[PDB]
Amino acid sequence: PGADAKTVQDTVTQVIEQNMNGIDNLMYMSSNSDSTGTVQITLTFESGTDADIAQVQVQNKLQLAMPLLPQEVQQQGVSVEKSSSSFLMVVGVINT
Amino acid sequence: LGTATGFDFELIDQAGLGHEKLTQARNQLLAEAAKHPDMLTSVRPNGLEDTPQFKIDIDQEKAQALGVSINDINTTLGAAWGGSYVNDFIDRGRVKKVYVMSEAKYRMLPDDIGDWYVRAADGQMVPFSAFSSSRWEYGSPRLERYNGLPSMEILGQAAPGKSTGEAMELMEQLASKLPTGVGYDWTGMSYQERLSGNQAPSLYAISLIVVFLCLAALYESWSIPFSVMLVVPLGVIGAL
Amino acid sequence: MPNFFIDRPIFAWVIAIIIMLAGGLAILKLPVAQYPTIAPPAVTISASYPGADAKTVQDTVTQVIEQNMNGIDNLMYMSSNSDSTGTVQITLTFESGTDADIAQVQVQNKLQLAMPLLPQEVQQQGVSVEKSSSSFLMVVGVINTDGTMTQEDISDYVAANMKDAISRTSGVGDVQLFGSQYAMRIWMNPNELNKFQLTPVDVITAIKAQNAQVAAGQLGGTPPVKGQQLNASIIAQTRLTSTEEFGKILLKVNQDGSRVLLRDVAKIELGGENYDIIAEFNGQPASGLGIKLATGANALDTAAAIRAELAKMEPFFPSGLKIVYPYDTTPFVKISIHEVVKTLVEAIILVFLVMYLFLQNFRATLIPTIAVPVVLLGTFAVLAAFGFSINTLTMFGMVLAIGLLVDDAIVVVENVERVMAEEGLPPKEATRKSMGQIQGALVGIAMVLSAVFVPMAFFGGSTGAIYRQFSITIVSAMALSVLVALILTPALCATMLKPIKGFFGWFNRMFEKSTHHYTDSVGGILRSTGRYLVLYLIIVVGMAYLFVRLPSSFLPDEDQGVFMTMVQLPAGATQERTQKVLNEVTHYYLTKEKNNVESVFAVNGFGFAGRGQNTGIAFVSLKDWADRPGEENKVEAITMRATRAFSQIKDAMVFAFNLPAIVELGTATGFDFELIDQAGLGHEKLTQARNQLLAEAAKHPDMLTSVRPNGLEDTPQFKIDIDQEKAQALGVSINDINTTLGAAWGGSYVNDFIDRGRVKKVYVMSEAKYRMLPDDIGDWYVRAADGQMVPFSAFSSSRWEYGSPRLERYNGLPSMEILGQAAPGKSTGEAMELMEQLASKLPTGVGYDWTGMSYQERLSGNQAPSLYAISLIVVFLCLAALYESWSIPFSVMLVVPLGVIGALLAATFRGLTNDVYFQVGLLTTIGLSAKNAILIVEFAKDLMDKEGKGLIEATLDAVRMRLRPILMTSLAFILGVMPLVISTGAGSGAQNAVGTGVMGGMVTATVLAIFFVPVFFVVVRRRFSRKNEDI
Ligand SMILES: CCCCCCCCCCCCO[C@@H]1O[C@H](CO)[C@@H](O[C@H]2O[C@H](CO)[C@@H](O)[C@H](O)[C@H]2O)[C@H](O)[C@H]1O
Ligand SMILES: CCCCCCCCCCCCO[C@@H]1O[C@H](CO)[C@@H](O[C@H]2O[C@H](CO)[C@@H](O)[C@H](O)[C@H]2O)[C@H](O)[C@H]1O
Ligand SMILES: CCCCCCCCCCCCO[C@@H]1O[C@H](CO)[C@@H](O[C@H]2O[C@H](CO)[C@@H](O)[C@H](O)[C@H]2O)[C@H](O)[C@H]1O
Ligand SMILES: CCCCCCCCCC(=O)OC[C@H](CO)OC(=O)CCCCCCCCC
Ligand SMILES: NCc1cccc(-c2ccc3nc(N4CCNCC4)c(Cl)cc3c2)c1
Ligand SMILES: CCCCCCCCCCCCCC
Ligand SMILES: CCCCCCCCCCCC
Ligand SMILES: CCCCCCCCCCCC
Ligand SMILES: CCCCCCCCCCCC
Ligand SMILES: CCCCCCCCCC
Ligand SMILES: CCCCCCCC
Ligand SMILES: CCCCCCCC
Ligand SMILES: CCCCCCCC
Ligand SMILES: CCCCCCCC
Ligand SMILES: CCCCCC
Ligand SMILES: CCCCCC
């Protein structure tokens, strides 16, 4: 919260990236760090990779980098999720 | 998947050049690409351009002379203007966050900076103006990295009548004339198209070869298979 | 099928072509490896406690982690080292077949329970959990040929621009930097600090405050006021980027207004995170990456991926920077496999030639020549179906399978060319009835021979995959051979066979006469059978003696074009002395092994046991095998001479050693012992127990040899006692004291900075000159609550003591590893039994265990004899079915010793052992021997059943008929396996070994069979009969 893109990149993104080692079947890695205080790092794996194994291997390397991140980021936490743009539906909730 | 039409290019800082030099190299590539409308169309960055930002320097000597700690200064600035997640409370049985932040009207403009006071060790309240200075500068609102290195993603597509493969060839030729230390890579759909294309010739060959061999066994003849295999264009022409 | 394809030769070709296409596509995609995977997965936890001694590491990190290691599936044992570089390594070794991904997940799930209990300094160094082999796959070296970059510069360039992408590459399980990345080094001066009434605590506090990256929010940020037109990020402090900026950190302002800057109390420079690892390439400054193969990953695919990634970096190198390749285990794999391919081709050509010699017709010879490639290519497709790899044993299966299937088509082609001579049927008509006579026996005999190898496919243990893949390859090839002989061969016999001197005339007539004296000799032997019965038994007793006389091993050492040299100095020795020893090692290879050594990559400060000022390693790469003729230019003799030369180096343990085929199984005669503190005795008592055990072992040179500890000896350490009362009285904080002491003498990782775009570390530490001497301790001052500067001498006392630089634990208890081996002639089992006896007489509370290779030894015992018994039983049963007789099978079984004797003869005279390759050749010999015997019995019995000829007439008519075709196929294969025997170059150790046993077994199985088989048949039928034969 409140961080600029360079602060995010240089205290969070680079640290996490430098720890994404020893993971199997990685094709490439990409990231953005932005002025809303957000970073997203996406690791893309070979077709046929077990997505659960890929995610736990990523999550476990991340876990061991958490002590290197700023306290404010440790407090917010860092989420690791399987990526997917396919929604079954979007339920809207409005007040009339 | 995305549009999966066009190409997906990564410009890469391979030698610690820095954001500004990478931007210059990007612009060089975009300008050259614009000189080949016959081959490339809508070659553009996928990210954001640098914007004005408000650089505030804390004067350490003045802070120390007044007895104001840097931690109080930076917490006061960050908590008021950026907001701060303090801890959690429990709202109707559900754990939720507590945030402190300035009310909107006291964190809008540079003149508001001087309305925020920090208590020194001797109890006196000191305004931010007394130990800071500011200036406008440019910086990035969105920094990109690719395989751990600074990068800028560039999207585009082949011009009408041209194949994406040909457009990729030119992009690579143009990229080879960029300043020292600037590399590139293909990602996404473009990574996908290169690998699928490298397989196609051998898969066609295996299909053609096995079809011939099955027919040769069927007819006990190395030549009669051809009379069947010649039919291929007859359907294809009407589909086209 | 035969009659079907005789009418459809193009269909036959189509099936052969599809078989070959599938095999060809398998060859392009199958994994390539030296051996099948047999090594158990190992997960290693690594952590670092900067400035910590071994006991501090053990008692605040290692024990905490170990106590959380529970509920982990398939765990065989756990071991750990805690050392006075501040490093701990904990290795968990799992059962063969364990999924390394799950083992890593399970280990980490438990580690995360321990992580919060670990010191913050340890957490912030980064704890790592890796799943990799223990040995290096390769070392990637980096030099600067223009000499414009120092060792430190190159190391930082590798760390900052190369290492991470290599570390992310799939199959790379671990990467060691031979060097260090740059950090911002603040080298504190205690005199200047005291002059300004400052301490390392103030320095650290000021760096955290003035090397900061501050989140400051936005102008016009959300939620905004109405009418806002400006939105912009606020940028406050950012990480410092240069020594200049660190130098002007403001520590304080004096009363008179003067400023104290960090550069007034410290020297500030870019320099390594650590200064322990310094490498050279052929004496020149270097860095590099030591790469370990991830568990179960393919070595060749991973090396290829590493090279492709390195190729992406090279264009952006600074001037002069160059990648060198001083140590790579993978070329040997690739080249050794290609050499077996070459001998496979050469074996096929040598078969084609020996047949043209006997057949004397290209057409008649070509049909067999076409069948073998079709079958072998198809066997590759079967390997893919079974999920096997192209490796040494599947490739030896390809070569040795030839001898057991080459007769399939020959029996078909010849039984046709005979039908066209007896009668006058055309080639097509003859093939049909010909196939009707042999088709059934072909299938059935292939099943009898398959019985030889099927049992061995059920071999257990880690060793089991070796015998399994070989057996499957042999059986698959024989099965495909039958199929090809029922599909392609009949079609070619019916389309190509020509309807039915010189050197050949000379050959034919020579053989004609030889056949005459042969049949004559046979008839004479039939009348003197009693004598030759006795001769047979002593062949069986001789075979028995040579079998027990022959020593046994697992896999021969191979010259792999590379090897390593270990440098171990006593703890307490300095970096400077280790470099002196490394210079001597490097000098020796560059001056005394000019003809053999291509490069030396020497690393000061790195060993396999662990880091330290007192340890180093030299990686040595040799010139190509072709440029190193003779055994004196092979790795074994090179390392022997080197170790002998290095024995004259004082105060150091230096030895060159070859890589073992399988590091896991390790030495052929070595053991791996663990002495265990079972009762909280403590390190000093355990050391004494160790010494007692080491002394008693020396008293038995008869059975034990080189029984030594694997770890390090105690060394002097500087014990300093902080006096709590004096510190309280002076108002000196214990936290200030410990931070001042640890930061100055051990170093402290303060926070991060940005060096040319890359996040890196900042370290404070005393400048070297103020942390070299015990007296320097009192030059460090701490500030009390009342502002007075207090020297360490005012509140501390010190004394010398002894302590351990490397504490070992095994399965969670204090331990000491002891290596050793059996004395000449003695067996490892005998040596281990003695060690157990000696261990039982040790002080109360001292226990023991076996690990590593010795865990495998006691675990998997001898299981080959039972499987050989099963094979023989099943072969006999299959023969009983083939001949519908319980007795006739013995006429074939009795030929097995005639072949086994030759394989033992050859292995003995040539000096080989009873290893993997002698056993796969021994099974092949059994099958080849039975095969040759059936090439006689099947015909001798065919006349007594179809031509009604008597026992003695049928026997002598068959041998005369079969002497030529038998010696044809037999000598062809004997010559065919010649390239295995005379093999030199990569993998020649395995080739020579497997060839010697098989060829030796073929020779005896061929010369003795043509004389003894007639005796076996006639004697067996006479005994087990009533009113049938002899007329
Ligand atoms: C009748 C001729 C034999 C058949 C021809 C060979 C068929 C193809 C064999 C497999 C592919 C080539 O592999 C064959 O073995 C190795 C491959 O490293 C080469 O061997 C050569 O180079 C290697 C290193 O590369 C040296 O260690 C070796 O001393 C030298 O002989 C042979 O020159 C090559 O012919
Ligand atoms: C019966 C006589 C014939 C017996 C012949 C047996 C030869 C077996 C030797 C193969 C050993 C080397 O195995 C080697 O593996 C690599 C890595 O997959 C293959 O590498 C291949 O990759 C791709 C597909 O994977 C191919 O498009 C490419 O042309 C080739 O480089 C080699 O083409 C193959 O030669
Ligand atoms: C797991 C349990 C199953 C495993 C069983 C092991 C079976 C092993 C069989 C060994 C081989 C048997 O080999 C078989 O022997 C018989 C003996 O009559 C031969 O002889 C037979 O040939 C054919 C078979 O249809 C008949 O027309 C003929 O009259 C008969 O003599 C066969 O041609 C041969 O194929
Ligand atoms: C004139 C040529 C027409 C080719 C049309 C192919 C369009 C499909 C492309 C595709 O998805 O590729 C899949 C696959 C690759 O092996 O396609 C093919 O294999 C196409 C070739 C099959 C036809 C040859 C047999 C002759 C008929 C008896
Ligand atoms: N029973 C009539 C009869 C009359 C005359 C001859 C054969 C004959 C047929 C096929 C044979 N197939 C054999 N092997 C070689 C090794 N591979 C498996 C198969 C061997 Cl050893 C002997 C063989 C005898 C059969
Ligand atoms: C791989 C293609 C094989 C084709 C073989 C053609 C048949 C054999 C040659 C013709 C034989 C007739 C001459 C007597
Ligand atoms: C798809 C590959 C087929 C190649 C074989 C051509 C057949 C030869 C024609 C003439 C035979 C009489
Ligand atoms: C446990 C190992 C299984 C053994 C497989 C059976 C061996 C014969 C297979 C032949 C394949 C054609
Ligand atoms: C028509 C028969 C074709 C199958 C040939 C089988 C050869 C023996 C295989 C042994 C399996 C254990
Ligand atoms: C003789 C061919 C045997 C079947 C080949 C099928 C290929 C299996 C790939 C997994
Ligand atoms: C791969 C197809 C080979 C067929 C050629 C036969 C021509 C006589
Ligand atoms: C581990 C699976 C083995 C598959 C065997 C296939 C038999 C042809
Ligand atoms: C471990 C026992 C295996 C025995 C294999 C038997 C095959 C018929
Ligand atoms: C293994 C069983 C053999 C039994 C032979 C019986 C002879 C009549
Ligand atoms: C009747 C024989 C057909 C076999 C095809 C594989
Ligand atoms: C006619 C039987 C076919 C067998 C193929 C494996």
Swiss-Prot record, chain C:
The chain crosses the membrane at residues 10-28, 337-356, 366-385, 392-413, 439-457, 466-490, 530-546, 863-879, 890-909, 916-934, 964-983, 990-1009. The keyword Cytoplasm does not apply. Residues 1-9, 357-365, 414-438, 491-529, 880-889, 935-963, 1010-1031 are cytoplasmic. The keyword Transmembrane helix applies. GO terms for molecular function: alkane transmembrane transporter activity; bile acid transmembrane transporter activity; efflux transmembrane transporter activity; enterobactin transmembrane transporter activity; identical protein binding; xenobiotic transmembrane transporter activity. It is a multi-pass membrane protein. SUPFAM superfamilies: Multidrug efflux transporter AcrB pore domain, PN1, PN2, PC1 and PC2 subdomains (SSF82693), Multidrug efflux transporter AcrB TolC docking domain, DN and DC subdomains (SSF82714), Multidrug efflux transporter AcrB transmembrane domain (SSF82866). This is Multidrug efflux pump subunit AcrB. It comes from Escherichia coli (strain K12).
